[PDB]
Amino acid sequence: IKAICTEAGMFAIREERAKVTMLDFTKAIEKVLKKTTPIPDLKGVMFV
Protein backbone atom coordinates (compact mmCIF):
# COMPACT_ATOMS: atom_id res chain seq x y z
CA ILE A 1 0.00 0.00 0.00
CA LYS A 2 2.96 2.42 0.80
CA ALA A 3 4.41 1.76 -2.72
CA ILE A 4 1.05 2.31 -4.47
CA CYS A 5 0.69 5.76 -2.70
CA THR A 6 4.19 6.57 -3.96
CA GLU A 7 3.23 5.49 -7.55
CA ALA A 8 0.13 7.69 -7.48
CA GLY A 9 2.12 10.85 -6.45
CA MET A 10 4.60 10.07 -9.15
CA PHE A 11 1.73 9.66 -11.61
CA ALA A 12 0.61 13.11 -10.67
CA ILE A 13 4.04 14.50 -11.59
CA ARG A 14 3.80 12.82 -15.03
CA GLU A 15 0.34 14.47 -15.46
CA GLU A 16 1.81 17.89 -14.60
CA ARG A 17 0.26 18.28 -11.18
CA ALA A 18 0.77 18.10 -7.51
CA LYS A 19 -2.83 16.99 -7.07
CA VAL A 20 -3.37 13.30 -6.65
CA THR A 21 -6.85 12.13 -7.78
CA MET A 22 -8.71 8.90 -8.53
CA LEU A 23 -7.30 8.21 -12.05
CA ASP A 24 -3.81 8.76 -10.66
CA PHE A 25 -4.76 6.13 -8.03
CA THR A 26 -6.26 3.54 -10.48
CA LYS A 27 -3.05 3.28 -12.62
CA ALA A 28 -0.92 3.18 -9.45
CA ILE A 29 -2.92 0.22 -8.21
CA GLU A 30 -2.74 -1.59 -11.57
CA LYS A 31 1.05 -1.40 -11.58
CA VAL A 32 1.20 -3.42 -8.34
CA LEU A 33 -1.61 -5.77 -9.59
CA LYS A 34 0.42 -6.44 -12.76
CA LYS A 35 2.98 -8.27 -10.65
CA THR A 36 0.70 -10.57 -8.67
CA THR A 37 -2.59 -10.82 -10.56
CA PRO A 38 -3.74 -11.14 -13.60
CA ILE A 39 -6.06 -13.98 -12.89
CA PRO A 40 -8.75 -14.01 -15.68
CA ASP A 41 -12.27 -13.19 -14.95
CA LEU A 42 -12.73 -13.48 -18.79
CA LYS A 43 -14.17 -16.95 -18.00
CA GLY A 44 -17.25 -15.03 -16.87
CA VAL A 45 -18.50 -15.29 -20.57
CA MET A 46 -18.85 -18.99 -20.24
CA PHE A 47 -21.06 -18.44 -17.08
CA VAL A 48 -24.65 -17.32 -17.63
Binding site: K43, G44, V45, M46, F47, V48
Partner: protein, 242 residues
Protein backbone atom coordinates in the same frame (compact mmCIF):
# COMPACT_ATOMS: atom_id res chain seq x y z
CA UNK B 1 -9.56 -28.99 1.61
CA UNK B 2 -6.41 -30.93 0.61
CA UNK B 3 -7.85 -34.02 -1.11
CA UNK B 4 -11.14 -33.74 0.66
CA UNK B 5 -12.32 -31.32 -1.99
CA UNK B 6 -10.68 -32.97 -4.99
CA UNK B 7 -13.27 -35.58 -5.48
CA UNK B 8 -16.97 -35.42 -5.02
CA UNK B 9 -17.06 -38.93 -3.31
CA UNK B 10 -15.20 -37.52 -0.22
CA UNK B 11 -16.32 -35.99 2.90
CA UNK B 12 -14.40 -33.51 5.13
CA UNK B 13 -14.44 -33.82 9.03
CA UNK B 14 -16.17 -30.47 8.90
CA UNK B 15 -19.04 -32.61 7.37
CA UNK B 16 -19.22 -30.30 4.39
CA UNK B 17 -19.07 -31.50 0.88
CA UNK B 18 -16.47 -28.97 -0.33
CA UNK B 19 -16.97 -30.08 -3.93
CA UNK B 20 -20.70 -29.07 -3.83
CA UNK B 21 -19.82 -25.73 -2.27
CA UNK B 22 -17.34 -25.14 -5.04
CA UNK B 23 -20.21 -26.02 -7.32
CA UNK B 24 -22.16 -23.28 -5.51
CA UNK B 25 -19.18 -20.88 -6.03
CA UNK B 26 -19.97 -21.53 -9.73
CA UNK B 27 -23.53 -20.14 -9.15
CA UNK B 28 -21.97 -16.95 -7.67
CA UNK B 29 -19.61 -16.31 -10.67
CA UNK B 30 -22.66 -15.97 -13.00
CA UNK B 31 -25.15 -13.16 -13.03
CA UNK B 32 -28.01 -12.35 -10.76
CA UNK B 33 -31.60 -13.62 -11.44
CA UNK B 34 -34.21 -12.53 -8.99
CA UNK B 35 -37.82 -13.64 -8.31
CA UNK B 36 -40.64 -12.30 -6.13
CA UNK B 37 -43.76 -14.22 -5.41
CA UNK B 38 -46.90 -12.17 -4.77
CA UNK B 39 -50.50 -13.33 -4.27
CA UNK B 40 -51.66 -12.27 -7.71
CA UNK B 41 -48.87 -13.77 -9.77
CA UNK B 42 -45.17 -14.58 -9.83
CA UNK B 43 -42.37 -12.35 -11.24
CA UNK B 44 -39.18 -13.46 -12.82
CA UNK B 45 -36.49 -10.90 -13.85
CA UNK B 46 -33.23 -11.93 -15.63
CA UNK B 47 -29.93 -10.20 -16.52
CA UNK B 48 -29.40 -9.96 -20.28
CA UNK B 49 -26.43 -7.68 -19.95
CA UNK B 50 -24.07 -8.03 -22.84
CA UNK B 51 -20.27 -7.84 -22.46
CA UNK B 52 -20.04 -6.16 -25.89
CA UNK B 53 -21.85 -4.28 -28.50
CA UNK B 54 -20.95 -7.24 -30.89
CA UNK B 55 -22.71 -9.62 -28.56
CA UNK B 56 -26.28 -10.16 -29.65
CA UNK B 57 -28.70 -9.36 -26.90
CA UNK B 58 -31.35 -12.13 -27.85
CA UNK B 59 -29.73 -15.07 -26.25
CA UNK B 60 -27.52 -14.61 -23.26
CA UNK B 61 -30.78 -14.93 -21.29
CA UNK B 62 -31.74 -16.91 -18.26
CA UNK B 63 -35.41 -17.21 -18.74
CA UNK B 64 -36.78 -20.48 -20.03
CA UNK B 65 -40.30 -21.47 -20.73
CA UNK B 66 -40.92 -24.95 -19.17
CA UNK B 67 -44.74 -25.34 -19.01
CA UNK B 68 -47.71 -23.26 -19.99
CA UNK B 69 -47.75 -21.70 -16.50
CA UNK B 70 -44.05 -22.31 -15.44
CA UNK B 71 -40.91 -20.35 -16.40
CA UNK B 72 -37.58 -20.45 -14.72
CA UNK B 73 -34.15 -18.79 -14.35
CA UNK B 74 -30.77 -20.32 -13.84
CA UNK B 75 -27.39 -19.23 -12.54
CA UNK B 76 -24.26 -21.38 -12.90
CA UNK B 77 -22.83 -22.70 -16.13
CA UNK B 78 -24.63 -21.93 -19.35
CA UNK B 79 -23.86 -25.47 -20.50
CA UNK B 80 -25.20 -27.20 -17.42
CA UNK B 81 -28.39 -25.07 -17.34
CA UNK B 82 -29.68 -25.72 -20.82
CA UNK B 83 -29.21 -29.53 -20.40
CA UNK B 84 -30.67 -29.46 -16.93
CA UNK B 85 -33.63 -27.32 -17.95
CA UNK B 86 -34.35 -29.40 -21.13
CA UNK B 87 -34.61 -32.16 -18.55
CA UNK B 88 -37.21 -30.02 -16.61
CA UNK B 89 -39.24 -29.60 -19.83
CA UNK B 90 -39.24 -33.35 -20.41
CA UNK B 91 -40.22 -33.97 -16.82
CA UNK B 92 -43.10 -31.54 -17.06
CA UNK B 93 -44.11 -33.35 -20.20
CA UNK B 94 -43.96 -36.79 -18.66
CA UNK B 95 -46.41 -35.72 -15.99
CA UNK B 96 -48.86 -34.35 -18.58
CA UNK B 97 -48.63 -37.56 -20.52
CA UNK B 98 -49.37 -40.03 -17.64
CA UNK B 99 -51.75 -38.10 -15.41
CA UNK B 100 -53.08 -35.52 -17.90
CA UNK B 101 -52.71 -32.84 -15.33
CA UNK B 102 -50.15 -29.99 -15.95
CA UNK B 103 -47.28 -30.24 -13.47
CA UNK B 104 -47.49 -28.25 -10.25
CA UNK B 105 -44.58 -26.10 -9.55
CA UNK B 106 -43.78 -27.93 -6.28
CA UNK B 107 -43.72 -31.47 -7.78
CA UNK B 108 -41.59 -30.26 -10.64
CA UNK B 109 -39.03 -28.92 -8.21
CA UNK B 110 -38.84 -32.23 -6.28
CA UNK B 111 -38.37 -34.14 -9.54
CA UNK B 112 -35.65 -31.91 -10.98
CA UNK B 113 -33.85 -31.68 -7.58
CA UNK B 114 -33.68 -35.51 -7.49
CA UNK B 115 -32.24 -35.51 -11.02
CA UNK B 116 -29.42 -33.22 -9.87
CA UNK B 117 -29.12 -35.59 -6.96
CA UNK B 118 -27.98 -38.73 -8.82
CA UNK B 119 -25.06 -36.59 -10.21
CA UNK B 120 -24.13 -35.45 -6.61
CA UNK B 121 -24.11 -38.89 -5.13
CA UNK B 122 -22.24 -40.42 -8.12
CA UNK B 123 -18.48 -40.27 -8.26
CA UNK B 124 -18.28 -41.05 -11.92
CA UNK B 125 -19.97 -37.74 -12.96
CA UNK B 126 -20.08 -34.30 -11.47
CA UNK B 127 -23.10 -32.43 -10.07
CA UNK B 128 -24.32 -29.32 -11.94
CA UNK B 129 -23.02 -25.98 -10.49
CA UNK B 130 -26.48 -24.49 -11.05
CA UNK B 131 -29.30 -23.20 -8.84
CA UNK B 132 -32.65 -22.59 -10.37
CA UNK B 133 -35.55 -20.44 -9.50
CA UNK B 134 -38.53 -22.31 -10.50
CA UNK B 135 -41.52 -19.89 -10.68
CA UNK B 136 -44.88 -20.74 -11.79
CA UNK B 137 -48.57 -20.62 -10.68
CA UNK B 138 -50.65 -23.88 -10.34
CA UNK B 139 -53.69 -22.66 -8.56
CA UNK B 140 -52.00 -20.06 -6.60
CA UNK B 141 -48.43 -18.78 -7.11
CA UNK B 142 -45.40 -20.83 -6.08
CA UNK B 143 -41.60 -20.02 -5.87
CA UNK B 144 -38.80 -22.45 -4.98
CA UNK B 145 -35.03 -22.25 -5.30
CA UNK B 146 -33.07 -25.42 -6.19
CA UNK B 147 -29.63 -25.75 -4.63
CA UNK B 148 -26.57 -27.32 -6.43
CA UNK B 149 -26.88 -30.24 -4.03
CA UNK B 150 -30.41 -30.80 -4.93
CA UNK B 151 -31.76 -29.14 -1.77
CA UNK B 152 -35.18 -27.63 -2.08
CA UNK B 153 -36.15 -24.46 -0.30
CA UNK B 154 -39.51 -22.63 -0.57
CA UNK B 155 -39.25 -18.79 -0.87
CA UNK B 156 -41.42 -15.77 -1.35
CA UNK B 157 -38.54 -13.46 -2.41
CA UNK B 158 -35.15 -14.91 -3.48
CA UNK B 159 -32.08 -14.41 -5.63
CA UNK B 160 -29.09 -16.38 -6.98
CA UNK B 161 -25.95 -15.13 -8.81
CA UNK B 162 -23.37 -12.47 -8.12
CA UNK B 163 -25.80 -9.75 -7.14
CA UNK B 164 -27.45 -11.95 -4.51
CA UNK B 165 -26.11 -10.55 -1.15
CA UNK B 166 -27.40 -7.05 -1.93
CA UNK B 167 -30.69 -8.39 -3.16
CA UNK B 168 -31.01 -10.30 0.17
CA UNK B 169 -30.47 -7.05 2.08
CA UNK B 170 -32.86 -5.23 -0.29
CA UNK B 171 -35.93 -7.45 0.12
CA UNK B 172 -35.49 -7.35 3.93
CA UNK B 173 -36.05 -3.65 3.85
CA UNK B 174 -38.05 -2.78 1.01
CA UNK B 175 -40.51 -5.64 0.14
CA UNK B 176 -44.00 -5.65 1.70
CA UNK B 177 -46.59 -8.24 1.74
CA UNK B 178 -49.52 -6.15 0.64
CA UNK B 179 -48.01 -5.25 -2.67
CA UNK B 180 -49.69 -5.95 -6.13
CA UNK B 181 -48.23 -7.22 -9.38
CA UNK B 182 -47.39 -3.73 -10.76
CA UNK B 183 -45.89 -2.44 -7.46
CA UNK B 184 -43.67 -5.48 -6.81
CA UNK B 185 -42.59 -5.46 -10.54
CA UNK B 186 -41.07 -1.97 -10.20
CA UNK B 187 -39.34 -2.97 -7.08
CA UNK B 188 -37.61 -5.84 -8.83
CA UNK B 189 -36.37 -3.44 -11.53
CA UNK B 190 -34.87 -1.31 -8.70
CA UNK B 191 -33.28 -4.50 -7.27
CA UNK B 192 -31.77 -5.51 -10.74
CA UNK B 193 -30.67 -1.95 -11.06
CA UNK B 194 -28.94 -2.14 -7.72
CA UNK B 195 -27.01 -5.37 -8.53
CA UNK B 196 -25.80 -4.25 -11.97
CA UNK B 197 -25.17 -0.79 -10.28
CA UNK B 198 -26.62 1.35 -13.03
CA UNK B 199 -29.95 2.81 -14.19
CA UNK B 200 -31.36 0.20 -16.50
CA UNK B 201 -31.91 0.51 -20.30
CA UNK B 202 -34.71 -1.92 -21.38
CA UNK B 203 -32.45 -3.86 -23.76
CA UNK B 204 -30.08 -5.30 -21.15
CA UNK B 205 -32.92 -7.04 -19.21
CA UNK B 206 -35.67 -9.51 -19.67
CA UNK B 207 -38.88 -10.11 -17.73
CA UNK B 208 -41.21 -13.15 -17.90
CA UNK B 209 -44.07 -13.72 -15.45
CA UNK B 210 -47.08 -15.86 -14.74
CA UNK B 211 -50.39 -14.31 -13.41
CA UNK B 212 -53.06 -16.46 -11.88
CA UNK B 213 -55.89 -15.12 -14.06
CA UNK B 214 -54.11 -15.43 -17.30
CA UNK B 215 -52.47 -18.63 -16.03
CA UNK B 216 -49.75 -18.13 -18.68
CA UNK B 217 -46.24 -17.28 -19.21
CA UNK B 218 -45.78 -14.08 -21.10
CA UNK B 219 -42.51 -12.49 -22.10
CA UNK B 220 -42.35 -8.68 -21.72
CA UNK B 221 -41.45 -6.88 -25.03
CA UNK B 222 -39.07 -3.71 -24.89
CA UNK B 223 -42.15 -1.58 -25.51
CA UNK B 224 -43.76 -3.07 -22.36
CA UNK B 225 -40.58 -3.00 -20.18
CA UNK B 226 -40.25 0.76 -20.40
CA UNK B 227 -42.99 2.08 -17.84
CA UNK B 228 -41.43 -0.27 -15.10
CA UNK B 229 -37.93 0.80 -16.03
CA UNK B 230 -38.55 4.52 -16.11
CA UNK B 231 -40.28 4.25 -12.62
CA UNK B 232 -37.30 2.27 -11.53
CA UNK B 233 -34.52 4.51 -12.74
CA UNK B 234 -35.89 7.25 -10.41
CA UNK B 235 -35.40 5.12 -7.29
CA UNK B 236 -32.22 3.42 -8.56
CA UNK B 237 -30.39 6.79 -8.97
CA UNK B 238 -31.22 7.69 -5.41
CA UNK B 239 -29.51 4.58 -4.14
CA UNK B 240 -26.40 5.22 -6.23
CA UNK B 241 -25.91 8.79 -4.76
CA UNK B 242 -26.81 7.88 -1.21
Amino acid sequence: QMGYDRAITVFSPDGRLFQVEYAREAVKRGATAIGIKCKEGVILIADKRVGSKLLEADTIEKIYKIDEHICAATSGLVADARVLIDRARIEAQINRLTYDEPITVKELAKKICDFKQQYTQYGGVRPFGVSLLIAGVDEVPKLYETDPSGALLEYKATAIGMGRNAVTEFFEKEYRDDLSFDDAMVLGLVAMGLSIESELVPENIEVGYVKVDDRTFKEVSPEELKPYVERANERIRELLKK
